[PDB]
Amino acid sequence: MKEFAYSEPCLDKEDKKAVLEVLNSKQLTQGKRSLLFEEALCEFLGVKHALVFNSATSALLTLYRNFSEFSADRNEIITTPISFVATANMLLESGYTPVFAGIKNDGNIDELALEKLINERTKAIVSVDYAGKSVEVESVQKLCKKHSLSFLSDSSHALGSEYQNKKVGGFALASVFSFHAIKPITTAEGGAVVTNDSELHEKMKLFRSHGMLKKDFFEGEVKSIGHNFRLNEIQSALGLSQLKKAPFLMQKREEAALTYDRIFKDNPYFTPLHPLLKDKSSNHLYPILMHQKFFTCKKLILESLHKRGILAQVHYKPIYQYQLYQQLFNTAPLKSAEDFYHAEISLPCHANLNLESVQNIAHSVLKTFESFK
Amino acid sequence: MKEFAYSEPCLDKEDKKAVLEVLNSKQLTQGKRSLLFEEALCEFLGVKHALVFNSATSALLTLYRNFSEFSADRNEIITTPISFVATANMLLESGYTPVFAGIKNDGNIDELALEKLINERTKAIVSVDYAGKSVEVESVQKLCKKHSLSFLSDSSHALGSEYQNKKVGGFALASVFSFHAIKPITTAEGGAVVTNDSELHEKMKLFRSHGMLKKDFFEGEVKSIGHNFRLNEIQSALGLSQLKKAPFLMQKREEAALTYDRIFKDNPYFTPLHPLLKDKSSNHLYPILMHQKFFTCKKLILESLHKRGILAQVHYKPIYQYQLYQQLFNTAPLKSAEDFYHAEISLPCHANLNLESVQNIAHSVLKTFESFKI
């Protein structure tokens, strides 16, 4: 039986050639390819600076630790409960208490529900471009300016996404991208922080690699801590090769999304989010939102989809529901987050899905919902 | 020209084949190859558990954070000032104050100078197998047991090294290895924590990947934080393939070391450490220690070596000399560490350095020293 993962990496012979070139060289890390990849990200995104890391989680920690010195008096960061747990775990590791905001129908943080959460301890707002869809950037920027907060963007899903016809990446103090295996482009594992703030770039650069600044070949200085979150040359070769075809890969996903939209239009069972886009999206996910009448049988629906070879997944359990977060914060549930979680299903959406497969999957999803009643 | 880096990666066709097979798969991370690599490490070392990480620095942080819950009352960890800075930086990141011990002529922590440093705040001792040479494991084990401290081993240089005919890796509560490009074997960047403590293994495993426990395909649980320090499948395939020939690569480095030993025997300028080994070493480095008369002209000597294409390096600046450590602590310099740093030069030594190359480098090193009058 043909099984469709919700996302998968999409490598070609050119990617493989790029990796082989590195294997033939004596420079497997700390080399020219990572630099080339960073420079290409700057040009693609129209930003001043980029740094690549072993994962977006390492990138998040690096950004959270470096965007400001920590103060115990300014320890709260407003963020969304509908993200992967990393967005919040790295807040905890950086000394910050996450303050969870309501979300909208489209999974994104509700820009109209943020101001009420701001108090004297608030340091920043961390938004997530859910499924690739840009948040309401102008609203968030203005609120952050008004209240002297930093705007940080977890854009892990959103490489190539746009807001008002400009690339996501340059709108916040800094933005994070992920190159995990199933992301818009991949380095197997990887991430990036991009920014227009040179001092922040320089701080993060040192934090990524031991805090070491070399005086000459033989001696360095370490003024502040750092780790080893570097991206090696093999992965950087892969990343650059993938980035060079990022618009192509994104459009393959857009083509799939448009086909789902056509077959799904006005169906009574669930609502796709993709038709509601106002700007280009990376289309990392293709979310559908089930009618509330299906909430209690969701496990049976997911199991039925999997039995048909449609390996759908849910993004995401509200972060505050996890035991760690309940233990530390005893957070009251947010209706918007709970309803979204109950409704959401992510369907197969990646650059290697042909339209015949998408058509078959789409009709099979409809038949699945019809079979329940 | 002809330039010799002090170490380099040594990949062959099997390694390249292994990587390419992964690229043909849909599973580029969180797959079977990292598990196979971990199992192969356990078989190679004779240990219960292995976990691979994106770097040894990630491995060190994971070990330091998880071997014990942190207590402000038990915040000191004794370690060596002659290591790469990561060994100590990850202590700071885990809440610990490093307490620097003296070292011996071979670069290793002085096991006879540790007990005097122990007090009510001491939590652990972190040793480093400098250049691949095992520290005096039995001495340190006994001391840690006596004082209820954890023995942690930064064995980053030492995959394949032995102590009393047993592989380094199983002697401490846990040990770290590095698979950086220039290390005994490589995954480009990578590291491992190995341990015989199952509870510690399971804690580190969650810390490596988000704290995530999966209930089913659809839902997980998080009871404690974690990061994403995973080693992907491409690098794990490389690691497995390299590990299969680790003894071969180690023996190539041993042959190079023996060639230097022959040419340097009874030379008037410096003392190689390699002839003093009592057990098999990974031979990650080939250190020589200059006569004190050359300390004041060391930079010129190093520059002369480099002009001859011998890209020698020094391991290591005493860690307490770094600005960060000077600002945080008031560390009196340690004569043993200062003298070692002033004396030491690491010469090219890796599995692809052929006999003719070693003979040429060795004769050039001698010529360089000869050129420096008083």
Swiss-Prot record, chain A:
The residues that hold substrate are 6, 26-29, 56, 178, 228, 313-316
**Keyword hit for Glycosyltransferase:** no
EC category: transferase
Q: Which residues carry this modification: N6-(pyridoxal phosphate)lysine?
A: 183
Instruction: Write down the Pfam families for this protein, in alphabetical order.
Output: DegT_DnrJ_EryC1
Please provide the record's keywords in A-Z order.
Aminotransferase, Pyridoxal phosphate, Transferase
Q: Does the keyword ATP-binding apply?
A: no
Membrane-crossing ranges are: none
Q: Which domain of life is it from?
A: Bacteria
**EC number(s) from the headed UniProt entry:** 2.6.1.92
Q: Which reaction does it catalyse?
A: UDP-4-amino-4,6-dideoxy-N-acetyl-beta-L-altrosamine + 2-oxoglutarate = UDP-2-acetamido-2,6-dideoxy-beta-L-arabino-hex-4-ulose + L-glutamate
In alphabetical order, the GO MF annotations are: pyridoxal phosphate binding; transaminase activity
Alphabetical GO biological process terms: polysaccharide biosynthetic process
Query: Per the similarity annotation, which family is this?
Result: Belongs to the DegT/DnrJ/EryC1 family.
Q: What does this protein do?
A: Catalyzes the second step in the biosynthesis of pseudaminic acid, a sialic-acid-like sugar that is used to modify flagellin. Uses UDP-2-acetamido-2,6-dideoxy-beta-L-arabino-4-hexulose as substrate producing UDP-4-amino-4,6-dideoxy-beta-L-AltNAc.
Q: What is this protein called?
A: UDP-4-amino-4,6-dideoxy-N-acetyl-beta-L-altrosamine transaminase
Per the UniProt record, the source organism is Helicobacter pylori (strain ATCC 700392 / 26695) (Campylobacter pylori)
Swiss-Prot record, chain B:
What biological-process terms (Gene Ontology) are attached?
A: polysaccharide biosynthetic process
Keyword Plastid present in the record's keywords: the answer is no
InterPro entries for the chain: DegT/StrS_aminotransferase, PseC, PyrdxlP-dep_Trfase, PyrdxlP-dep_Trfase_major, PyrdxlP-dep_Trfase_small
Keyword Cell division, does the record have it?
A: no
Its top-level enzyme class, in one word, is transferase
Q: List the disulfide bonds.
A: none
Q: Which UniProt keywords apply?
A: Aminotransferase, Pyridoxal phosphate, Transferase
Q: What is its EC number?
A: 2.6.1.92
The protein's matches in CDD domains, at most eight in alphabetical order, are given as: AHBA_syn
The highest taxon in the source lineage is Bacteria
Q: Which residues bind substrate?
A: 6, 26-29, 56, 178, 228, 313-316
- Which residues does this entry mark as bearing N6-(pyridoxal phosphate)lysine? 183
Recorded hits in Pfam families, A to Z, give: DegT_DnrJ_EryC1
A GO MF annotation of the entry reads: pyridoxal phosphate binding
Which reaction is catalysed here? Answer: UDP-4-amino-4,6-dideoxy-N-acetyl-beta-L-altrosamine + 2-oxoglutarate = UDP-2-acetamido-2,6-dideoxy-beta-L-arabino-hex-4-ulose + L-glutamate
Function of this protein?
A: Catalyzes the second step in the biosynthesis of pseudaminic acid, a sialic-acid-like sugar that is used to modify flagellin. Uses UDP-2-acetamido-2,6-dideoxy-beta-L-arabino-4-hexulose as substrate producing UDP-4-amino-4,6-dideoxy-beta-L-AltNAc.
What's this protein's family per the entry?
A: Belongs to the DegT/DnrJ/EryC1 family.
Its name, as the record gives it, is UDP-4-amino-4,6-dideoxy-N-acetyl-beta-L-altrosamine transaminase
Q: Which organism is it from?
A: Helicobacter pylori (strain ATCC 700392 / 26695)
